[PDB]
Design a binder for this molecule. Structure first.
Ligand code: SR9
Length: 460
């Protein structure tokens, strides 16, 4: 069938031109990147390793494959070296890709399931040496293909196995388990266990009120990406490995003209999907970078708001940084801004739709911190943006309690004006008036007492 090959040629060229350029750009980008952050650099090395392996598959394996294996009528044009080299390089890359793919699964698992251990015990230098081992291990396990494959004349020349069927069955079965089955088994398990561990963390993190930490939200996106990579790897590589197992077992005697025509379709289809796996690789890079960038932007926003770098804050929000980013303890940037007393940074965030009634672990809102600080302008600002006046923490402490306790008469007058419940008291039973007396802020006590008595007059 002439048409079949013409259709395959078009698809191969399509995967070749964009896949080669696609992965080429990824390497060029990473090489010049000069990333300062550890997480960025750590991931980039793996993406580069995947970019390199998948580029080599498209640059060298595909052209040889297309000319001598798809268009079979051509005699072998690459000589004995080209035959042995083709299968060696092809085998080395399959391994490398599979090992890199599962290497992402252990790194995600470690990050999710051993956060304390991983954070401390992960360095850039550790990753470089680890990846070096993968390529070496792959190259070592690829060497056999230099000895198992060679040129035989059936007068034309064909790049065919030169060893006996028994020896051939072993090496490929070894390669199948080592470079696919084992990796994809581990990849699936580690992902599934990490996915379950993550789900607990999300439920543990978010309760009555704690929002959701940005770092968890990053890992929650992480599993979803690798979930796609494993499902993507299996559908693309299973047919290839299954075809190779068919070839070794379906050896001699039964090799009819008809059986080959069938196997040739399998060969076109199975290899096309391998080149698809190489061609979609740059999407994983884009998705990985998009995620890692969003995480860094969010970290920067929390750092900037605390530091009081108003210029930085604006820059980040302009480039779609998450306004409502909780830290480890559930602190939004508005908390940190209001805490440190950056009226400008507070105004900017609220303008970009910052959650005015966000809660931390202790249940503190931004207003609680502004009342503690005593910054009247921010308190006024927050209340204008619809901040809850009678919001209470775990202990039952409210803004009025904090203000009165620490002696901010202007804040106390402001809070009462916005419908603050003077009567409301904490778990210990103390009202603001009781706390004001306890601290001895007599000027404030008089201000509160009059309000309570006014409420009694209003009742009759
Ligand atoms: C198990 C692997 C180490 C070898 C396998 N190669 C083959 O199955 C092929 C081996 N040849 S061939 O050039 O040796 C060949 C050429 C022509 C007729 C053949 C009949 C039976 C077996 N091979 C024949 C192919 C021709 C077209 C498509 C595929 C092949 C592969 O590349 O995956």
């Amino acid at each position: 069938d002439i048409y079949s090959k013409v259709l395959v040629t078009a698809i191969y060229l399509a995967l070749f031109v964009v896949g080669t350029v696609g992965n080429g750009v990824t390497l060029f980008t990473l090489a010049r990147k000069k990333s300062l952050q550890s997480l960025q650099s750590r991931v980039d090395y793996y993406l580069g390793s995947l970019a390199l392996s998948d580029l080599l598959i498209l640059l060298f394996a595909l052209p040889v494959d297309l000319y001598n294996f798809i268009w079979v009528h051509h005699p072998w044009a690459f000589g004995d070296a080209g035959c042995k080299g083709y299968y060696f390089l092809r085998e080395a890359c399959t391994y490398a890709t599979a090992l890199n793919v599962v290497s992402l699964s252990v790194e995600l698992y470690l990050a999710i399931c051993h956060p304390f251990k991983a954070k401390t015990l992960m360095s850039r230098s550790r990753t470089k040496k680890f990846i070096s081992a993968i390529w070496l291990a792959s190259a070592l396990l690829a060497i056999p293909m230099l000895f198992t494959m060679g040129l035989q004349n059936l007068s034309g020349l064909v790049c065919t196995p030169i060893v006996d069927t028994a020896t051939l069955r072993v090496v490929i079965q070894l390669n199948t388990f080592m470079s696919f089955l084992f990796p994809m088994l581990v990849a699936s398990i580690l992902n599934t266990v990490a996915a379950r561990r993550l789900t607990v963390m999300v439920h543990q993190a978010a309760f009555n009120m704690t929002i959701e930490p940005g770092r968890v939200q990053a890992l929650r996106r992480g599993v979803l990406v690798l979930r796609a990579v494993v499902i993507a790897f299996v559908v693309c590589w299973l047919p290839y490995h299954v075809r190779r197992l068919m070839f070794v077992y379906i050896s001699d005697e039964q090799w009819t003209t008809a059986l080959f025509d069938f196997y040739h379709y399998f060969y076109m289809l199975s290899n096309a999907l391998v080149y698809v796996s190489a061609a979609i690789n740059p999407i994983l890079y884009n998705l990985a970078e998009d995620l890692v960038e969003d995480w860094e932007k969010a970290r920067k926003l929390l750092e900037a708001a605390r530091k009081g770098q108003d210029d930085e804050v604006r820059i980040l929000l302009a480039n779609g940084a998450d306004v409502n980013t909780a830290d480890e303890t559930g602190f939004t940037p508005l908390h940190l801004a209001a805490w440190e007393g950056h009226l400008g940074i507070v105004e900017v965030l609220l303008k970009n739709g910052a959650d005015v009634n966000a809660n931390d672990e202790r249940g503190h809102t931004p207003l609680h911190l502004a009342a503690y600080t005593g910054h009247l302008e921010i308190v006024e600002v927050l209340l204008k943006n619809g901040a809850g006046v009678n919001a209470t923490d775990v202990i039952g402490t409210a803004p009025l309690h904090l203000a009165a306790m620490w002696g901010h008469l202007e804040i106390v007058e402001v809070l009462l004006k916005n419908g603050a419940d003077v009567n409301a008291q904490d778990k210990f039973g103390k009202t603001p008036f009781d706390l004001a007396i306890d601290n001895g802020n007599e000027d404030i006590a008089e201000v509160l007492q009059k309000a309570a008595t006014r409420e009694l007059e209003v009742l009759f």
